[PDB]
Amino acid sequence: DIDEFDLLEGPSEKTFKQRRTFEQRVEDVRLIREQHPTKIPVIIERYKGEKQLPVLDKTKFLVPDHVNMSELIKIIRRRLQLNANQAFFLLVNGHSTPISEVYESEKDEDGFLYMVYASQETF
Amino acid sequence: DEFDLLEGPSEKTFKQRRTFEQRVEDVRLIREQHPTKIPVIIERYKGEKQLPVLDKTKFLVPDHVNMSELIKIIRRRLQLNANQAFFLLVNGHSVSTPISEVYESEKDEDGFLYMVYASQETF
Amino acid sequence: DEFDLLEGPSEKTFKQRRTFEQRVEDVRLIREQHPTKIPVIIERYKGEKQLPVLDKTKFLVPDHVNMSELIKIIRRRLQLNANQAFFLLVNGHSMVSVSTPISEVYESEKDEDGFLYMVYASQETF
Amino acid sequence: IDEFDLLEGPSEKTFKQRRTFEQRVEDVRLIREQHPTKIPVIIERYKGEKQLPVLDKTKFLVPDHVNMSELIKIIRRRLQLNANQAFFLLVNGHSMVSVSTPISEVYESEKDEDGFLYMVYASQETF
């Protein structure tokens, strides 16, 4: 009996936007941008169908505008404590340079830049 | 609820991303090929907290452009609003003179003209 | 019991609501039709907490208006008395002092798109 | 077991139904500031179309050097059609078949108030 596991069916993983109202997200960005004008408000979440990489401990981040995607990837890799073999991809609008430029092009209606990470470059 | 601020690697200067010999060679070709254009480095001041980062660092400025015209060009590349202060410092110095005269007085050992911009005049 | 502030997404600036080519064609039409008037964008500072907003953003300033007269015009649209602080900023510089023809300001300060951009606020530095 | 049973969800919403007349204008404003030589076009399959396949995307950029005849030919091989297949591209109720005028002229006369040029494709020319 205790040779076998019982998987507990849990609730669905919920995204940041369903965890926080759009007005709270706009007030979040508005306050953080007036007071930290050189830092980009970034949402980083695990791809919903991801089954190799662990979950990050936080979701809402502020990234200095001089940080590029390659440096950001390395930061998230140590936060997840990945080993050198583990694959990691960070997707903005499904697509795998300084973040401020990504921010100006891809930021959300609510002012956040949304990113999704996975162990594959795929959809 | 609160943001988690990610700090990245140090903002490293142009002289830190390119060796003195590569920079010397950069100038030598561009001045041999564009004798009437000034090779200019424009970087955001190190402790700058309000202005955004520029997308490029290495610029060519026609030799007849004056400092006042260059400031307006940079203000518009940064998409600044009319209220936003902007100062362009050459060797710490913040005008109706042609860039070619500034180039002859202030150019670096490597042949580049170095400029730093900030929202404050002096530091 | 407490007030709750209703905010939407950031309202966009004039340059964010109209392309560079639409603005150039805006200016070319208005300069062909009003040869003695200067096209000026006047917007309230994004973080302004004291001065009211104007209904309009796109303005024509007759060439006989100097900077001192223009300041008084905008102050009186805002219904300020002589007491209240008011600053009108062009390319990062507040223009209280100038009291100069609008055509000179336009020719020295206009944007590449042909508009002269101004921001007003109750503070001079940010 | 002899016959197939059709799987269907609620009616799919068109682009104009999935996007308010603010998200669409604001889309055009960024894309036209950023790609001044490309025309923003919505291309959707006729809602009752039973012959032509669906495209993966709805929002397209057409370079200004593309004329209507070349655009049709682009969509036809994007759909991987045979040489037969009837294919008609309709704008504001009109079949674009023998137009061949530059896309920017089509755009300026036929664009929507929101700034998109709307097109629908089908294997029939009338409805």
Residue of A nearest to B46 (CA): A66
Query: Could you tell me which of C13, D125, A90, A19 has the C-alpha nearest to residue B81?
Result: C13
- Tell me whether B83 touches chain C (CB under 8 Å): yes
Q: Which of D64, D20, D13, D11 is nearest to D41 (CA)?
A: D64
Question: Which residue bears the tokens 């020719």?
Answer: C107
Place of tokens 């940041």: A16
* Strand locations in chain C (E): 37-44, 58-62, 87-90, 93-94, 116-121
Residues 6+ apart with CB under 8 A from B122: B92, B94
Euclidean distance between CA atoms A56 and A117, whole angstroms = 10
> What is the domain-level CATH number for residue A93?
3.10.20.90
Chains contacting C (3+ CB pairs below 8 angstroms): A, B, D
First to last CA, chain A: 38
What is the helix (H) or strand (E) element at residue A113, kind and residue range? strand A113-118
C-beta of residue D22 within 8 angstroms of C-beta of residue D98: no
CA distance A100 to chain C (A): 17
Segments in A2-95 forming alpha helices (H): 16-19, 22-35, 69-79
- Tell me, yes or no, whether chains B and C touch by having 3 or more C-beta pairs under 8 A: yes
Distance of CA B106 to the CA centre of its chain: 13
Contact call for A75 and B6, based on CB within 8 A: yes
Which residue do the tokens 């109750």 mark?
A: C122
Contacts of C125 in chain B (CB under 8 A): 85
Q: Check if B86 contacts C (Cβ < 8 Å).
A: yes
Inspect the interface and report whether the beta carbons of A27 and C7 lie closer than 8 Å.
yes
Cα separation, D124 vs A115, in Å, equals 42
For residues A29 and A37, the answer to whether their CB atoms sit within 8 Å is no
- CA nearest to C106, candidates C96, C95, C97: C95
Q: How many domains does chain C have?
A: 1
C38 shares contact with chain B (CB less than 8 Å): no
Cβ contacts (< 8 Å) between C7 and chain A: which residues?
Answer: 23, 26-27, 30
Q: Give the span between the Cα atoms of A65 and A76, in whole angstroms.
A: 16
For this PDB entry, the determination method is X-ray
Q: Are A50 and A119 in contact (CB under 8 A)?
A: yes
Host domain of residue C77 = 1-126
Q: Which amino acid belongs to residue D77?
A: R
Contact call for D and B: 3+ CB–CB distances under 8 Å: no
Taking the Cβ of residue D29 and every Cβ of chain C, the question of whether any pair is shorter than 8 Å is answered with: yes
Q: Is B53 on the interface with A (CB under 8 A)?
A: yes
CB contact under 8 A, C9 and A34: no
Nearest CA in chain A to C46: A34
CB contact under 8 A, A98 and B2: no
How many other C-beta atoms lie within 10 A of the C-beta of residue C103?
A: 17
Q: Which tokens sit at C20?
A: 């560079």
Distance from CA of A106 to the nearest CA of B (A): 16
Most A-contacting residue of B1, B3, B45, B55 (CB-CB within 10 A), to test interface: B3
Longest alpha-carbon distance in chain A: 58
**Residue appearing with tokens 């629908």:** D120
Residue A39: phi and psi, rounded to 5, are -125, 140
Instruction: Quote the CA–CA distance of A55 and A118 in Å, as a whole number.
Output: 10
Q: Three-state SS across C29-43?
A: HHHHHCCCEEEEEEE
Tell me the residue type at C52: P
Sheet holding A113-118, edge to edge: A89-91, A113-118, A39-46, A60-64, B4-5
| Interchain CB distance below 8 Å, A109 and C9 | yes
Residues 6+ apart with CB under 8 A from C109: C90, C91, C116
CA distance B32 to C62: 49
